[PDB]
Design a protein around this nucleic acid. Structure first.
Ligand SMILES: OC[C@H]1O[C@@](CO)(O[C@H]2O[C@H](CO)[C@@H](O)[C@H](O)[C@H]2O)[C@@H](O)[C@@H]1O
Ligand SMILES: [Mg+2]
Lengths: 550, 416
DNA sequence: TACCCCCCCTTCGGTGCTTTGCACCGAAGGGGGGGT
């Protein structure tokens, strides 16, 4: 027998006492027969006069099956049960597998019910089932094993499964076993005879510890169904993706739709979800129907064209380098491919996170590289060589001048438009023979009415009244005014820390229409010098323009 | 048959529950080998998911070392473990260490594996080794002996440590020895040859105990007597443009938060009109005194700035470009205990993250020598960028606390 | 009327300097996927 795992309740808390809700007849019948089976197997014990505890029970159908799995609502016990540290750290990915001569996929049958619960804890799993729709009091039962619905059942089974597999792996060092919950993957470069032997040795060792491996779940011939994928001997692919083609879309329809596209992006290159996700943004409840934007259904059409073809990934060769190649897709969307040989993608993906109100492509490309680096270390344990649509000169100018530390590992330029570039560069020194604009802006906190303007050495001046604004908005506005009214070269002086912080980071896109307008001006200019001075220190036109807008 | 020193967390605090981060292949291989050898020797033992605690682990190579070293990020555990100053186990700090001509850093963490750890405290040292592509669920261990990198290990071991060093100390009473975490700081005023000689003596002295009652051979040489300080300096010009004086006034106005006697009145007056930034303007006679007076004020030390042993140290770092990095150490804002500048570090002109990692290590090293504390860093870098790369460049056996800041340089304050 | 893990996109409230607006970030809830 599998040694138990000592499990306690949270200090000073007692077991659950939640009475069964009313159950519809059809379930009550199937429930009683499922209980009696578990009684005969010994998975549930019959005692119930002495245990005051009860938890509600329910049943749902098993996937692709007539069979019914009984469900226990243990959330109250969950709150009172000690916390567990989960040993499932991530999800295996087919692109991390090496190619194997012989492969087997088998599943443990009735996983949780083959691992004996901690002796003392069994009494708290107590439950009651109405024998005939609350006609007869019914029978109380306790679990003898890990019960479905208990927050500690996955971790305890998972760890027990590993302790059982531990000696088998150590004493067969030329086998590779991937364990996810009960589900097992077994690969070897052995003759299919020696492989079938080792497999049978594994099932005996597993059955010997009370873990069955039914033949119904014993896959022997490709394509192996595993973790939602299809494994062939030299290529892998995803199990078919079902795209809802409904003409009427609710919120929930788009959520399901966007999620499926996300899942597809791991191998289907070029998937984009920005426009569809924009449809989701808003207080709209799950039921309300939403019409597709013109650009939104253009994205869906391009997605279909990607999902039309059948794509396949290859497996990993630890002797070859890893290669990551990124392309800009516009509007803060990026896709990438990881591969070791051309056009034989291990996997693909997308990065589209828009973090920050004001950013640029270089920042986003760095974030995309950082995501790819981390995803790669998870799957292969090393950093891939990168191929990026950015000139070496561009990057060198960016990272050496930016005030934050930033870096990209070994990479080379790939000349695939649209290339990433910096759209403007602020001068380091004031421009001789360029009009100098001292700008400032102010708004009344109570009024929300503001003025923005500037004064110039040549004596040019301007003040603009503004409504429904803030101090910061007016400070940007004054800089916008100076850019609009100046020549191709201009020196601008301001006292807005807020404004200079944004502009000096060379953003090329912004969530603020006004910042976007400033960016547009900066791109048109030839030389722009920004300088900060402290406010209220009687400096230059700063003190003169501070009186105009105050 | 050694009795375990009982240890308790600070009342009202749970153990650490920090998730393990992904590890490269070479680092997982190093950990699996190291943890296998440690398990055979009883230093660690396998545990299950019923232990709710976890602390991240990874591996490093020290400077000019080819052999991997296991490193546990006990920062969370260290902040949740009872302060041993209340217990009186805490180590005192020698003010003379920073005055010695040479100070050698010795890894002595191996010694700590000889002392059992209190049974009731072992559950808090849990860590999880991950696997490439998640082939296996995490393999959890916990510590049975004093673990490297935990602040309780040197405290509990201090009794044995003082006894071991007692002969060497009495023979050479001029040598200062300070213990911080897994390291031994041994400073002397001897000539370099005799200094390394005395360090070699102490090595074999430690082995004699190791034979009777990562490796010890490595040693790093500091020279704290030569540690410069980088102060605030005003430029020297004979001709000033409007832009120059605007910069000067802004810089002086910022410095006034540190030196209150600084004035900008006569200099600000020079900016009355609205003029092109480029225009050259002669300094008024009154202004010249104000600048010279200000330069004099900057020379003198700040008033009422001193080290408080009960307050934490804070370090800020600024990237100045061209491989130049400035830093300030303080406990209260604008009361800097030390300021400095680094240039031409490893990774200069190619890698920002390596340079910043080196700066953090250098600053922590100085803080340990000068005050016996490691500061909390304000790092000029994005969180994702730092977390992606820093373990590739880390070469120390401790890890300081850090937070992330984004402060655009409006005044070139610490660097001209 | 259930449990544990990973992923993306959005929303929302807490936190700290850009200050009483604005920017950032982590949590949580929607979806996808895996297994009981
Ligand atoms: O980079 C900080 C990052 O690390 C985490 C997880 O490892 O926490 C560790 O680092 C913190 C920063 O010093 C420590 O305070 C903490 O104790 C330590 O576990 C994350 O919490 C944090 O985002
Ligand atoms: Mg003003």
């Amino acid at each position: 027998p599998i040694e138990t795992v000592p499990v306690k309740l949270k200090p000073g808390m007692d077991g659950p006492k939640v009475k069964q809700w009313p159950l519809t007849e059809e379930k009550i019948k199937a429930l009683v027969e499922i209980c009696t089976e578990m009684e005969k197997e010994g998975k549930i014990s019959k005692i119930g006069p002495e245990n005051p505890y009860n938890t509600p029970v329910f049943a749902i159908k098993k996937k692709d099956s007539t069979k019914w799995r009984k469900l226990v609502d243990f959330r109250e016990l969950n709150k009172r049960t000690q916390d567990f540290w989960e040993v499932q750290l991530g999800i295996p990915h087919p692109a991390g597998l090496k190619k194997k001569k012989s492969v087997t996929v088998l599943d443990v049958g009735d996983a949780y019910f083959s691992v004996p619960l901690d002796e003392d804890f069994r009494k708290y799993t107590a439950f009651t089932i109405p024998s005939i729709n609350n006609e007869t009091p019914g029978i109380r039962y306790q679990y003898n094993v890990l019960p479905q619905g208990w927050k500690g059942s996955p971790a305890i089974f998972q760890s027990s499964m590993t302790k059982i597999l531990e000696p088998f792996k150590k004493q067969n060092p030329d086998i590779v076993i991937y364990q996810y919950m009960d589900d097992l993957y077994v690969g070897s470069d052995l003759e299919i005879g020696q492989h079938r032997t080792k497999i049978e040795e594994l099932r005996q060792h597993l059955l010997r510890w009370g873990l069955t491996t039914p033949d119904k779940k014993h896959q022997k011939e490709p394509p192996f169904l595993w973790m939602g994928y299809e494994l062939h001997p030299d290529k892998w692919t995803v199990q078919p993706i079902v795209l809802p083609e409904k003409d009427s879309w609710t919120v929930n329809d788009i959520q399901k739709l966007v999620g499926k596209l996300n899942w597809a992006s791991q191998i289907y290159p070029g998937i984009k979800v920005r426009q569809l996700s924009k449809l989701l943004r808003g207080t709209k409840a799950l039921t309300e129907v939403i019409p597709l934007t013109e650009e939104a259904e253009l994205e869906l059409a391009e997605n279909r064209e990607i999902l039309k073809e059948p794509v396949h990934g290859v497996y990993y060769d630890p002797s070859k380098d890893l290669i990551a190649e990124i392309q800009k897709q516009g509007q803060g969307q990026w896709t990438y491919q990881i591969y070791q040989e051309p056009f034989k993608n291990l996997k693909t993906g997308k990065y589209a996170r828009m973090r920050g109100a004001h950013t640029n492509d270089v920042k986003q490309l760095t974030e995309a590289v950082q995501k790819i680096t981390t995803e790669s270390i998870v799957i292969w344990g090393k950093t891939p060589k990168f191929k990026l649509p950015i000139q070496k000169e561009t990057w060198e100018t960016w990272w050496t001048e930016y005030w934050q530390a930033t870096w990209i590992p070994e990479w080379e330029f790939v000349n695939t438009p649209p290339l990433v570039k910096l759209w403007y560069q602020l001068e380091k020194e004031p421009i001789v023979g360029a009009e100098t604009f001292y700008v400032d802006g102010a708004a009344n906190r109570e009024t929300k009415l503001g003025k923005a303007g500037y004064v110039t050495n040549k004596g040019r001046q301007k003040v603009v009244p503004l409504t429904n604004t803030t101090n910061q908005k007016t400070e940007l506005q004054a800089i916008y005014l100076a850019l609009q009214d100046s020549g191709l070269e201009v020196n601008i002086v301001t006292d807005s820390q807020y404004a200079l912080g944004i502009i000096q980071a060379q953003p090329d896109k912004s969530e603020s229409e006004l910042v976007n307008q400033i960016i547009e001006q900066l791109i048109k200019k030839e030389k722009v010098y920004l300088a900060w001075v402290p406010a209220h220190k009687g400096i230059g036109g700063n003190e003169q323009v501070d009186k105009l807008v105050s | 048959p050694i009795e375990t020193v009982p240890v308790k967390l600070k009342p009202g605090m749970d153990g650490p529950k920090v998730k393990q981060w992904p590890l490269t292949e070479e680092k997982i291989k190093a950990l699996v080998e190291i943890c296998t050898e440690m398990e055979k020797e009883g230093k660690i033992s396998k545990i299950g998911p019923e232990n709710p605690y976890n602390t991240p682990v990874f591996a490093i190579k020290k400077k000019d070392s080819t052999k991997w070293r296991k490193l546990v990020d006990f920062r969370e555990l260290n902040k949740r473990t009872q302060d041993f100053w209340e217990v009186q186990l805490g180590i005192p700090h020698p003010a003379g260490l920073k005055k010695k001509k040479s100070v050698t850093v010795l890894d002595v963490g191996d010694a700590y594996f000889s002392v059992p750890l209190d049974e009731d405290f072992r559950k808090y040292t849990a860590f999880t080794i991950p696997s490439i592509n998640n082939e296996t669920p995490g393999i959890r261990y916990q510590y049975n002996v004093l673990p490297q990198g935990w602040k309780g290990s040197p405290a509990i071991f201090q009794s044995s440590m003082t006894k071991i060093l007692e002969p060497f100390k009495k023979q050479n009473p001029d040598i200062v020895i300070y213990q911080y975490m897994d390291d031994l700081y041994v400073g002397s005023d001897l000539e370099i040859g005799q200094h390394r000689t005395k360090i070699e003596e102490l090595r074999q002295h430690l082995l004699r105990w190791g034979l009777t009652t990562p490796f010890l051979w490595m040693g790093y040489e500091l020279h704290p007597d030569k540690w410069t300080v980088q102060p605030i300096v005003l430029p020297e010009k004979d001709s000033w443009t409007v832009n120059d004086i605007q910069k000067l006034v802004g810089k002086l106005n910022w410095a006034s938060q540190i030196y209150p006697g600084i004035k900008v009145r006569q200099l600000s007056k020079l900016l009355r009109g609205t003029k092109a930034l480029t225009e050259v303007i002669p300094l008024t006679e009154e202004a010249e005194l104000e600048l010279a007076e200000n330069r004099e004020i900057l020379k003198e030390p700040v008033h009422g700035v001193y080290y408080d042993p009960s307050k934490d140290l804070i370090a800020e770092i600024q990237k100045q470009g061209q491989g130049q990095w400035t830093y300030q150490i303080y406990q209260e804002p604008f009361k800097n205990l030390k300021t400095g500048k680094y240039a031409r570090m490893r990774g200069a002109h190619t890698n920002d993250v390596k340079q910043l990692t080196e700066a953090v290590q250098k600053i922590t090293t100085e803080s340990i020598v000068i005050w016996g504390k490691t500061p909390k860093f304000k790092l000029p870098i994005q969180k994702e960028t730092w977390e992606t790369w820093w373990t590739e460049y880390w070469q120390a056996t401790w890890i300081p606390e850090w937070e992330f800041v984004n402060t655009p340089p409006l005044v070139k304050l610490w660097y001209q």
